[PDB]
C-alpha cells in the first residue's frame, strides 16, 4: 500500500530520468563527447532495467502502474527543460549527478517504506538499485574533480 | 535546407516516443490466452521502435536540427492518443490497438519517404524505407493472428 | 540455528515433490497452448532444481543432514500427488502449477521469518531471492488465465 | 541393393513435396496461434531438408541417380498438393501436417525393412533416426489438437 | 500495384526452379574442382532460399497469393530443367549456373522498374539488394571460367 | 513388452537420480573436489535418458509413472539413509553397482524391443547402454579394477 | 554507356586509398590529451574506409572496368593532398583534418550518387548512399567533440 | 572497529594479506592432489580480488580513504605470514586455507552487524554475499579433509 | 563370448594407426595444383581417424581386452603397407592412394559389423556402422574430384 | 640502412607497396583456382597489415618518424609496380606473390642482423616472427606450383 | 643480482609493488579523463599479474624459492610507496605510472643481459616479451602527455 | 643448415614415439587419480602433435624430407617402448611420463644449440618455445609426486 505507492513513484521518476538522459546524449558538445555520449546509453539501459522491475513488481502485488506520458510528467518530481547545444560538457555531467542523487534518495525512501510493511522483495530491488546509482555518483564526481558527497 | 525532411523526422521523434509508451502499457496490462507469447513480443517491438527513434533523431541532429527531448514536447506534438491502463481489455483488443499504432507509423514513414525524395535527401529517404518495410511485415503477422488479411 | 535447519530441510522435500508434479504436467499436457506451455515446464523444473541444491547445500554447510531418499521426500512434503491424467485441460494444468507455486511462496516466507529471527542472514537471502521469482511466475500464469496475481 | 536404392529415391521425391506443403502452410496460415506455429513450420522445413540431402547423397554413394527436377518430384511422389488458401483454420492446417508426417513415418518404415533384408546397414540407420524424430513431432502436434498420437 | 504483385510471384516460381537446378549441380558434379564447388552450391542455395521467402512474404503483405505447389512453379517459371547427368564437365556445370544467374538478374531489374513506376518503394529495395549480390557472383564465376563478367 | 520396460526404466532412473544426489551431498575424503562435481555430470546424463524414455512411451500410447509413490514402489533399486561416515571408495562402489543394474536393464530393453520390431526404442536403449558401460570402465579404473562387465 | 559510373567508382578507389594513408598518419603522429580515445578510433575509421574501397573497386570490375591498382595511380588521380608527418600538430588540428577529408568524401559520394542515378545504375547508386550515410554521421560526432555544429 | 568505513578498510588490509597467502600455497604446493588444488587456488585468489575491489570502492563512495600500500596492509591486518616452505604437505596447505577462510567469514559477520546498526544497507548486502560464498568453500575444503565443516 | 569382436577391434587399432601415418605423409609431401584445398583436408581426415582409434580402443579396454600400444605391434598387425615419402608423386595419385586406404578401412568396418552382430555385441556393432557410413561418403567425394563414380 | 630505425622505416615502405601488389592480384585474377586464391589474397593482406603497423609503432617507440605518404612509400621501396592486367595467368600471379615474399624474407633477415648487432632485442624478435611465417607461405605457394621452396 | 634466479626474484618483488601502486592510482584518481584512465589501470594491473606468475613459476621450475610475503616484497623492491591522495592531477598520476614502467623496462634489460650471459634462453625470452609491451605502453602514455617516448 | 635439418628430423621421430607412449599411459592407467590424469594425457598428446607438425613443416620448408613411416620413427628414435601393462601403478606411469619429458627437453636444447651455431634463427625459436612448456610440465608432474623439478 505504501510499498505500492513508492514503486509507482519510481515508475514515474525513472520515466522522466530516461528522457533527461536522452536529452544529454543528443545535445552533448565539447571535449569529452566521445566517451560520455555512448556512456549515457549504458545509463539509460540501467534506468530501463529498474523501470521494468519496479513496475512489474507493483503489478505482481495487485497495483496499477502509471503507463502514459501525462501520468509520468504530472507525478514525477523531476523537472525538464528544452534541449540546448550550448550547455557545457561539465554542466551536462553536473545535471546527471543531480538526477542520480534524487533517485538515490527516492530508493532509500523505497527501502524504508517496504521495510516497515515487511515486503522483503520490494526492499531488495531498491537496495540493489541504490547500490549502483551511488557508485555512478562516485565516478561522475571524480571526472568533475570532486568527492562523492553522499 | 531540407525544411520538410527535418520536420517529418521531428514528427517521428514525438510519435515514436508515444508509440513506445503505448506498447509498454499493452505489455503490462495484458491478460488472457496468448499472454505468454505476446507479452515478450511487445519487448521485441519496443526495442525496434527505440532503434528508429534514435536513428531518426540523430539524422535530424546531423542535418542542423533540434530534436524534441522532453515528455511535454512528445505529447503535445504527437498525433497518437493515450488512455489510462486497464486490465479488462481483451487480448484481441490489445493486438488491434497495436495494429492501429503500426498503421499510423507506416503512413508516417510513407510521408517521410515522399518528402525526402523530393528534397534530394537520399539518406533520410532510406531510413524511412527500411522502417516502413519492417512495420508492414509486422502488420501482416498481427492481422494474421487475428484471422484477417493485412488490408494495407 | 535449529529452525533455519528445519525449514531448509522442509524445502528439500517440497521442492522434490514440486519437481515431480511439474514433470507430470509436462508429460500429460493436452490442448491448445501445448506448444508454448510444454517447454515452459522445462524452465520451471530447472529453476526448482537450482533451489533444491542450494538450500540442501546450505543445510550441509550449517552442519545438518539433508533428506536424500524418495521415502523422506514423500513423508515430509505437504504437497499431494495423484495419478497422471491426459484428460485434464490446459487451463486446469496451469491452475495446478499456480497452487504449487502459491504453497512454495508461503514456505519461503516462513523460511525468511525464522532465519531473520535466528540471525542467519545467508539463509535469509536464499529464501528472499527464490520468493521474488516464484511470485513473478504466479503473476504471468494468472494473466494467461485472465486473472490477477491475488497474492 | 536394388530395393534400397529405389526406396531412397522415393523419399527424395516425397520429401521434396513435403517441403513444399509445409512452405504453403507457413505462408497461408491465419488465426489464433499463428505466432507460435508460423515459425515452427521453418524448423520442420530445415529438418526435412536435412533428410533430403542425407538420403540423396547416400543414393549417390551407392552408385545411383537421384530425382533432380520438379517434374520428377511431382510425378514420383505419393503426396497430393492443392492450391494455397487463406481460409483454412489453424486446426485444419495442423492436421494436414500430421497427415504428411504419418505418410513419411510409414515410408521410413518400408525403408528400414527393405534395407535390413539386403544387409545395407548404413541406409538402415538413416531411416531409423529420421522415423524416431518424425514420430516425436506427431505426438506434439496431436497433443496441441487435444488428441492422442494414435501411431 | 498490379504489376508489382505479378513479378514478385514470377520470382517465387523462377527462384523455386533455380533452387532445384543448383541442387542437381551440387549432386551430379564430377571433375577437378569438386571439393571447392560442391559446398559453394550450398551457399547459393541458402541465398536463393532467402530471396524466395522475402519476396513471397512481401506479396502476402500486399494482399496477394503466392504460388505454393510444384505444379505452379514448373508451369510459371521460364527456366527449363533437364535430367541429371554425371558426364557433364565442371566447366559446363559452372556455365549453366552463370546462365541461370544472368536470367535472375534480368528478372530482378524488371522487378525494380515496375515497382518504381507503381510507387512501391519497399519492393523496389528487395529487388535492388538481390540484383547487387547475384551480379557479384557472376563476376566470380566468370573469373573462375577465364572470362570477363559481360553483364 | 516395450511399453512395460520403458516404464520400468522411468522408475529405476528416478531412484538412481536420487542415489547420485545422496552421494554428491554426503561425500567426504580425498578425491571430493573431483568426484563431487562428477556426480553432477552423471545426474544430467541420467535425467537425459529419463526424459527420452518417458517421451517415447507417451509417443507409443503409454502412460508413464509420474509420482514418487510409483517410482519408489516399482523400482528394483533400494535406498538408505545418508551417512557422512561412508568412505570415498565405498561411495564409488555404490555408483558402480547402480550402473551395473542400469546396463542389465537397458540390455533387457534392447532384447525385448528387438523381438517386437520397435527399432526406434531399440536404438534408445543401445545408446544409453554404451555410455553407462564406458562409465563402469572409468570408475572401476579409479578403484584399481578391471571393468569386469 | 555506363562510362561516367565507372569513372566515378575509379575516382573513389584513388581517393579512398589516399584517405587511408592520411588516417594512418593521424593514428601514428597523434599527441595530446584524448590520445587514448582518438588513436584507436582512427583504426575503426581505417576499417570502414577499407570496406568502401573494396566494395567500390569490385563493383567497377563487375561492370567491365579496370580499377586503379598502384600507388602512382592513386596519387595522381586523387584530389586529396598529403603532407609530411609531424608530431607537433595538436589534437584539435588532427581531428579538424579528418573532418576535412570526411567532407570531401561525403561530397564525392554525393556526385557518385548523382552520376549512377542518371545512367540507370541503381546498384552502384545504393553503394554510394550507404557510405554517405555513415560518413555524415561521423562528421556530426567529430564536430561535437570540437564544440561545433555539423555544418553539412 | 568504530563504524562501516572502519570495517571496510579493515577488510581491504585482510584481503590483501589473504591474497598473498593463497599465492604462497599455489606456488609451494607438493604431493598427491597438486594437479587439482594448484589451479583451485587461482579461483580463490580471483574471488578474493573481487571482494577487495567491491569493499574498497564502497569505502570511497562513502567518502573514505582505503589502505593502498603494503606496509598499511601488513600493519593493519590480523593475519600473520611465514616464509614459503615446500615441505608443507597437501593436507597442511589445505588446513591453512581453511584457517584463513574462517577468519574472513568472522570479519564479514562483524561488518554485517556494524552496517546493520548504522542503517547502511548497501554495505550490509556486500558483506552478506561475501560470507555466503566463503562458508560454502569451507564445507568443500573440510569435506576433502574428511571432516564436517564446523562453522 | 566376445573373442572375435575383441579381435577385430584391435585389428582396427593397428590399421587406424598406420592409416593415420599414411595420411600425414600425403599431407606433407603433396605438390601440385589443388595443394591448398587438399593439404588442410588431410588434417580433417587425420582427426576423424583419431576419433575412431580412441573409441575402438576404449571399447576394447571396456570389454576386458588389451589394446596394441606400440609402433611395433601396430606395424606388424596391420594389413596396410607403407613406402618412403616422395615429393614427385602427383596430386591425383596421392588422392588415389588415400582412396585405397579408405576402401580397405570400409571393408574392415564391414568385417567388424558382421562379427559383432553374430556375437550380440550391439554397442560394438553401432561404432563400426557409424565409421563405415562416414568413410564411404569421403570415398564418393574423393572419386568425384578424380572424375569417377564411387564404385563401392 | 645503417641502424635498427632505418630498417624499420624501410620495412614500412616495402610492406605498403607489397599490400598494393597483393590487392592487384586479388582484383585482376582469372582462371581455375580463383575461388580459393582470391580470398587467400585477403589473408595475406591482413597479415602484411599487421607487420606494417607493428614495425611502424616500434619505430615511433624508438623516437623515429615512419614514412606516412604514398610519395614516401613509393620512393623508398625497392618493389616495382605495373598496371593491372586481366590476361596474366593464375600460375603467373602466384609466381609474382612468391617473388614479393622472397624479397620481404630477405629484408627481414637484414633487419634481424642489424638489430642483433645493436642489442635491440625487441626489434630483433619482431623480424624473426615475421620471417618465420612468410617462409612457411613460400613453402605452400611453391607447393601449389609443383616446386620445392628453394629458400 | 649475480644470476638468472636472483633477477627473476627481484622481478617478483618489484612486480608486487608495481601492482600496489597501480591500484592506488586506480582508486584515488580525480579529474577530466578519469573515465578512460580508471579502467585502463585494471588492464595494466592484469598484465603485471601475468608477468608475476610467469617469472615466479620459471624460478620454481629452475629450483629456487620465490618471495611470498608482503614483508619480503616490500623490503627487496627498489620502488617507493607513498600514501593515497585524491588531490593529484591526472597528468601527475600518469607521470607516476611512466616512471614505474621505465624502472620495470630497465630491470627486464638486466634480466635479459644476465640470462643471455648464462645461456638460459627460456628465461631470456620471458624478459624480452615483457620488455616489448611495457615499452609500447610508455609511448602511448607519453603521447597522451604530449611527449616523445624518450626511452 | 645440415645439422638443423638433422635435429628437426630426430625430433619428428622422437615426438612420434612420445605420442605413442602417452596414449599407452592414457589407456592402461588404473588407480586413485585416474579421473584427473587420464584426460591430462590427452592435453599432452595434443601439445606433442603440435610440436611434431611445426618441426616437420620447418624441415620441409628448409629443403628436407621428414621421416613419414612407422618403421622410420621406430628405428631412429632413442625412446624404447614396452608392452602395455595394467599393473603399473599411477605413480609409476607419471614417473614414466617424466622420463620422456626429460629426454625431450634435452633434445630441444641440442636443437637450440645447433640452429644457433648455424644461424637458423626461426628454427632456434621453435625449439626454445617447446623447451619452455615441457620444462613447466616437469615441475608440475614432479610436484604431484612430492619432488622438486630437478632439471
Ligand atoms: Ca574458359
Ligand atoms: Ca553519362
Ligand atoms: Ca568427367
Ligand atoms: Ca603471361
Ligand atoms: Ca610435380
Ligand atoms: Ca596538488
Ligand atoms: Cl491482486
Ligand atoms: Cl569535493
Ligand atoms: Cl581397491
Ligand atoms: Cl593537443
Ligand atoms: Mn517487461
Ligand atoms: Mn544514440
Ligand atoms: Mn550440488
Ligand atoms: Mn549436400
Ligand atoms: Mn518465412
Ligand atoms: Mn521433456
Ligand atoms: Mn575483396
Ligand atoms: Mn576497480
Ligand atoms: Mn581417450
Ligand atoms: Mn596501430
Ligand atoms: Mn600460477
Ligand atoms: Mn600440418
PDB file of N, CA, C and O and ligand atoms in Angstrom, chain A residues 31, chain G residues 31-34 88-93, chain K residues 144 146, ligand 10:
ATOM      1  N   UNK A  31      34.844  18.943 -25.545  1.00  0.00           N
ATOM      2  CA  UNK A  31      35.841  17.921 -25.346  1.00  0.00           C
ATOM      3  C   UNK A  31      35.335  16.841 -24.359  1.00  0.00           C
ATOM      4  O   UNK A  31      34.854  17.168 -23.285  1.00  0.00           O
TER       5      UNK A  31
ATOM      6  N   UNK G  31      49.484  13.299 -30.707  1.00  0.00           N
ATOM      7  CA  UNK G  31      49.981  13.622 -29.356  1.00  0.00           C
ATOM      8  C   UNK G  31      49.088  14.636 -28.653  1.00  0.00           C
ATOM      9  O   UNK G  31      48.688  15.628 -29.274  1.00  0.00           O
ATOM     10  N   UNK G  32      48.804  14.410 -27.363  1.00  0.00           N
ATOM     11  CA  UNK G  32      47.963  15.329 -26.597  1.00  0.00           C
ATOM     12  C   UNK G  32      46.849  14.638 -25.830  1.00  0.00           C
ATOM     13  O   UNK G  32      46.565  13.463 -26.049  1.00  0.00           O
ATOM     14  N   UNK G  33      46.214  15.371 -24.922  1.00  0.00           N
ATOM     15  CA  UNK G  33      45.178  14.785 -24.072  1.00  0.00           C
ATOM     16  C   UNK G  33      43.969  14.356 -24.931  1.00  0.00           C
ATOM     17  O   UNK G  33      43.471  15.131 -25.771  1.00  0.00           O
ATOM     18  N   UNK G  34      43.510  13.123 -24.704  1.00  0.00           N
ATOM     19  CA  UNK G  34      42.485  12.485 -25.529  1.00  0.00           C
ATOM     20  C   UNK G  34      43.048  11.458 -26.516  1.00  0.00           C
ATOM     21  O   UNK G  34      42.283  10.842 -27.252  1.00  0.00           O
ATOM     22  N   UNK G  88      53.859  17.673 -33.932  1.00  0.00           N
ATOM     23  CA  UNK G  88      53.535  18.904 -33.249  1.00  0.00           C
ATOM     24  C   UNK G  88      52.156  19.479 -33.544  1.00  0.00           C
ATOM     25  O   UNK G  88      51.744  20.428 -32.875  1.00  0.00           O
ATOM     26  N   UNK G  89      51.480  18.940 -34.563  1.00  0.00           N
ATOM     27  CA  UNK G  89      50.062  19.195 -34.818  1.00  0.00           C
ATOM     28  C   UNK G  89      49.301  18.887 -33.517  1.00  0.00           C
ATOM     29  O   UNK G  89      49.635  17.922 -32.821  1.00  0.00           O
ATOM     30  N   UNK G  90      48.313  19.707 -33.162  1.00  0.00           N
ATOM     31  CA  UNK G  90      47.543  19.476 -31.922  1.00  0.00           C
ATOM     32  C   UNK G  90      46.417  18.429 -32.154  1.00  0.00           C
ATOM     33  O   UNK G  90      46.137  18.068 -33.297  1.00  0.00           O
ATOM     34  N   UNK G  91      45.772  17.975 -31.075  1.00  0.00           N
ATOM     35  CA  UNK G  91      44.626  17.071 -31.168  1.00  0.00           C
ATOM     36  C   UNK G  91      43.469  17.670 -31.948  1.00  0.00           C
ATOM     37  O   UNK G  91      42.926  17.013 -32.853  1.00  0.00           O
ATOM     38  N   UNK G  92      43.102  18.903 -31.607  1.00  0.00           N
ATOM     39  CA  UNK G  92      42.077  19.648 -32.342  1.00  0.00           C
ATOM     40  C   UNK G  92      42.371  19.712 -33.842  1.00  0.00           C
ATOM     41  O   UNK G  92      41.464  19.477 -34.651  1.00  0.00           O
ATOM     42  N   UNK G  93      43.622  20.043 -34.201  1.00  0.00           N
ATOM     43  CA  UNK G  93      44.047  20.139 -35.599  1.00  0.00           C
ATOM     44  C   UNK G  93      43.880  18.779 -36.323  1.00  0.00           C
ATOM     45  O   UNK G  93      43.316  18.716 -37.416  1.00  0.00           O
TER      46      UNK G  93
ATOM     47  N   UNK K 144      49.798  10.698 -24.788  1.00  0.00           N
ATOM     48  CA  UNK K 144      48.710  11.348 -24.034  1.00  0.00           C
ATOM     49  C   UNK K 144      49.191  12.627 -23.311  1.00  0.00           C
ATOM     50  O   UNK K 144      48.431  13.588 -23.177  1.00  0.00           O
ATOM     51  N   UNK K 146      51.575  14.574 -24.312  1.00  0.00           N
ATOM     52  CA  UNK K 146      52.163  15.489 -25.292  1.00  0.00           C
ATOM     53  C   UNK K 146      53.658  15.353 -25.507  1.00  0.00           C
ATOM     54  O   UNK K 146      54.302  16.314 -25.944  1.00  0.00           O
TER      55      UNK K 146
HETATM   56 CL1  LIG M  10      46.663  18.988 -28.008  1.00  0.00          CL
END
